[PDB]
């Protein structure tokens, strides 16, 4: 499923992401834009045999288990398949753990590169939340 911007904003708001660990809702929408282009089925293979899964490109070495990744830690205690669902809930709940790790949203490279320090509110503007 490919979310619309305001569709995803409303879903993320319902999941309690607004100001989660200090990050306003626009940060989360922007992150999903640049991580996955709002595509819940996005995947990216890495050179360590891990794969990044879903709308927030969560990694299979550290966070979810896909059964094929060397050195798997599964800190979110979930199958990576759950992160390719059309509803965002498993991704969100694992993202809540990631963003709480100690370095905020810097975990997301696309967020660092294209969202951090920008007018992130623009991503929720017009959505009538």
């Amino acid at each position, epitope marked *: 499923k490919v979310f619309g911007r305001c569709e995803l904003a409303a879903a993320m708001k319902r999941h309690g992401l607004d100001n989660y660990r200090g990050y306003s809702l626009g940060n989360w929408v922007c992150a999903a834009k640049f991580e996955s282009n709002f595509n819940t089925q996005a995947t990216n293979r*890495n050179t360590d045999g891990s794969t990044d899964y879903g709308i927030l490109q969560i*990694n299979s070495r*550290w966070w979810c288990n896909d059964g094929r990744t060397p050195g798997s830690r599964n800190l979110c205690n979930i199958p990576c398949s759950a992160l390719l669902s059309s509803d965002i809930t498993a991704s969100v709940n694992c993202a809540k753990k990631i963003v709480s*790790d*100690g*370095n905020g949203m810097n*975990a997301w490279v696309a967020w*660092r590169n294209r969202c951090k320090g920008t007018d992130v509110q623009a991503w929720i503007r017009g959505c009538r939340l």
Partner: nanobody
Amino acid sequence: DVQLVESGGGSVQAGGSLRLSCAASGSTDSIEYMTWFRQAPGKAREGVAALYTHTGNTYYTDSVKGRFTISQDKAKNMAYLRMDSVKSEDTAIYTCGATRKAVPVRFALDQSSYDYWGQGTQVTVS
């Protein structure tokens, strides 16, 4: 790929100070952590001090807390280890490591978390 190059090192008196430097080059944009490891004679490599480059947050092994300081110059892709109040037990080969993955803090002092390594530099406490 990322190349890491150490400078500094050598002999130092107990109680004294040395500074090590690590310069990264190559695909440096994606560097997440720069971290110092060491390996003392007859022992396994251990993580000493890790720095998360996008926040400046630092993580230390217990045996060096308060004495060693890791810092950076992010704009120059540099990491530094200032070793103050050195002890006998600090004699070791010190190696710079880096990774381009966003390793959980709890694994930031484990060597298997790292993808890129320098050459090692000897520090000897007399």
